[PDB]
Amino acid sequence: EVFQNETIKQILAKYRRIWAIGHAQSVLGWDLEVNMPKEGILERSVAQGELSVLSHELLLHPEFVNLVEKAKGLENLNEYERGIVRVLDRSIRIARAFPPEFIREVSETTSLATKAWEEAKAKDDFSKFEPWLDKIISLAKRAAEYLGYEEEPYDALLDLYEEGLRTRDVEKMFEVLEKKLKPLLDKILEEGKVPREHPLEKEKYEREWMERVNLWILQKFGFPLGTRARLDVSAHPFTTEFGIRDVRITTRYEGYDFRRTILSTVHEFGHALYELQQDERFMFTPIAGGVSLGIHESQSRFWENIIGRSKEFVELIYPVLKENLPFMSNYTPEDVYLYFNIVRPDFIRTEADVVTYNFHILLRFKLERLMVSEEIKAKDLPEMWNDEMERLLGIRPRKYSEGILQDIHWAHGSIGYFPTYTIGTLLSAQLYYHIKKDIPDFEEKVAKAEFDPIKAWLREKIHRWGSIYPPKELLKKAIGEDMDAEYFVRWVKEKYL
């Protein structure tokens, strides 16, 4: 049926091994974050490392590569078998772009740069990270040259994290935002409409109280606990896929500002449903699973902001908040609403409300394009970052930790990664209007906890397709169009005005 071609089957049989190491890697990483006794880190680390080298070795074995090339030379193949090749061709390609020595240099430099960035952020000292940043800039440029690119070197890094993404693409969405979203922000901020803070941010809670609320929400979403999924705690919320029938998410309980653990759980749920609603006929194959960081963030943001910050979701959970939170006997559902939608330009990207968030990404985008294009100087980045923070949000970081040092991405060498976050926010808006068309009673269903039709709409349009088509081709096929920042602007307008 789905996999008929003989060359394709030989490939899938070998791929199983590669797939198994990956299954193992996920379990290792998840366990490292959720269960592992602290001192087990050295042995976990070497195990993770040996497998990554083993995995890479198997992907580039002559036999495997020969098969992919051969199949790539077949015209008989259906879309599914074709998806196998497109995906595997991109992997083998990316994997052999870097000389084994270069992969080594990066691992070394990266590891040491992360540690240096880690103390530098804590002690607010850019000098301790600066030289490491210059080394990472050089590695990024080299990487762009190893990967190859038509227009700009930055296209190669972007394409690394979002298949088919180009600098021109990113340049465009941010233009529409800077001229249409920026003013909307100013207007919102000056009418005193929504507040910049809320007393509910200070209300403390005991872990068990919120875990009762999160649990209730996940069951309302139909999250298949104990059967195909789990919810646990870890330093930072994430989602992992051990398989189509085994997807896990985590959240954290800060102990105060209950909005965090709630929306964070919902956010991760969005990622999970996606992996959960994959097509089982693709099990063990490279086409199963979310196609990219951007499409994945369109799902997490869809559930988090489109639904989670909506008045209806608030009414639905309101009674549960009252049952488990004592301090809730002093607030109304509107109080919870305003709380969930506060708007306030601030220093930290991970705390940015939905209206100011994308400006944190635009600046990282500008600095990144410059770093890999022109001959930018690390020692000069802090001020450029500061001037940009001031030009977009009116505030200026006073210390390195509130600014250029806040995120781990650069130290990890993840240059050309940040833009995928904006894509997700944008795409979540666009998807909302397309579903709002097939399900005009969208809001009413949320308020009543009737999510099946919404979950099914997402499946047919996005999920079941896995990695069959590249990100762009996937959107056209399912939404009749390409990403368009315009939707995010209307969503915001229609929500704050």
Bridge pairing between strands 239-243 and 246-251: antiparallel
Instruction: Tell me the CA end-to-end span of the chain in Å, nearest whole number.
Output: 52
Beta strands in 344-474 (DSSP E): none
- In whole angstroms, the minimum distance from the beta carbon of 241 to Mg ion comes to 13
Looking at the chain, how many residues does it have?
A: 497
- In whole angstroms, the minimum distance from the beta carbon of 400 to Mg ion comes to 26
For residue 391, the SS3 value is helix
Distance CA 449, CA 456 (A): 14
What distance lies between CA 232 and its chain's CA centroid? 19
Considering beta carbons, is residue 23 or 409 the nearer one to its own copies? 23
Q: Which residues, including other chains, have CB under 8 Å from residue 4's CB and lie 6 or more apart?
A: 78, 81
Distance CA 253, CA 181 (A): 32
Considering beta carbons, is residue 216 or 284 the nearer one to its own copies? 284
Question: What residue 493 binds from its own copies, Mg ion, none (CB within 5 to 8 A, per partner kind)?
Answer: none
Considering beta carbons, is residue 300 or 406 the nearer one to Mg ion? 300
Scanning residues 226 to 285, which ones bind Mg ion (CB under 5 A)? none
Question: What residue 447 binds from Mg ion, its own copies, none (CB within 5 to 8 A, per partner kind)?
Answer: none
Question: What residue 35 binds from Mg ion, its own copies, none (CB within 5 to 8 A, per partner kind)?
Answer: its own copies
Question: What residue 374 binds from its own copies, Mg ion, none (CB within 5 to 8 A, per partner kind)?
Answer: none
Count the residues of the shown chain that bind Mg ion, applying the rule CB under 5 A. Answer: 1
Considering beta carbons, is residue 44 or 72 the nearer one to its own copies? 44
Crossing angle of helices 486-496 and 419-438, rounded to 10°: 70
Distance CA 453, CA 267 (A): 19
Q: Output DSSP code: residue 242.
A: E
412 marked as part of a ligand binding site: no
The answer to whether 85 and 71 are in contact (CB under 8 A) is yes
Q: Provide φ and ψ at 418, rounded to 5°.
A: -40, -45
Question: What residue 300 binds from its own copies, Mg ion, none (CB within 5 to 8 A, per partner kind)?
Answer: Mg ion
Distance CA 415, CA 350 (A): 18
- In whole angstroms, the minimum distance from the beta carbon of 26 to its own copies comes to 10
Considering beta carbons, is residue 40 or 183 the nearer one to its own copies? 40
Q: Which residues, including other chains, have CB under 8 Å from residue 268's CB and lie 6 or more apart?
A: 237, 238, 239, 249, 250, 251, 300
- In whole angstroms, the minimum distance from the beta carbon of 270 to Mg ion comes to 8
Residue 68, classified by CB atoms within 10 Å of its CB into exposed (0-12), middle (13-18) or buried (19+), is buried
Nearest to 389 by CA among 374, 402, 370: 402
Torsion of CA 25, 30, 33, 39, to 10 degrees: -50
**Active-site pick, 268, 275, 368, 388:** 268
The answer to whether 487 and 311 are in contact (CB under 8 A) is no
Question: What residue 380 binds from Mg ion, its own copies, none (CB within 5 to 8 A, per partner kind)?
Answer: none
267 marked as part of a ligand binding site: yes
- In whole angstroms, the minimum distance from the beta carbon of 245 to its own copies comes to 4
Considering beta carbons, is residue 264 or 285 the nearer one to Mg ion? 264
Residue nearest to Mg ion (CB): 300
- In whole angstroms, the minimum distance from the beta carbon of 228 to its own copies comes to 5
Type of residue numbered 22:
G
Distance CA 467, CA 181 (A): 32
Interaction site with its own copies (CB under 8 A): 16-17, 19-21, 23-24, 27-28, 31, 35-40, 42-44, 46-47, 49-51, 53-54, 224-230, 242-246, 283-284
Is 69 among the residues known to form the active site?
no
- In whole angstroms, the minimum distance from the beta carbon of 38 to its own copies comes to 6
Residue of 261, 300, 358, 401 interacting with Mg ion (CB under 5 A): 300
297 marked as part of a ligand binding site: yes
Considering beta carbons, is residue 278 or 300 the nearer one to Mg ion? 300
The answer to whether 206 and 212 are in contact (CB under 8 A) is no
For residue 84, the SS3 value is helix
Lookup: tokens for 77? 């193949």
Nearest to 346 by CA among 335, 357, 333, 332: 357
Interface contacts to Mg ion, rule CB under 5 A: 300
Binding residues, as ranges, are 267, 271, 297
Query: What are the residue numbers of the active site?
Result: 268
Binding residues for Co(2+), as ranges, are 267, 271, 297
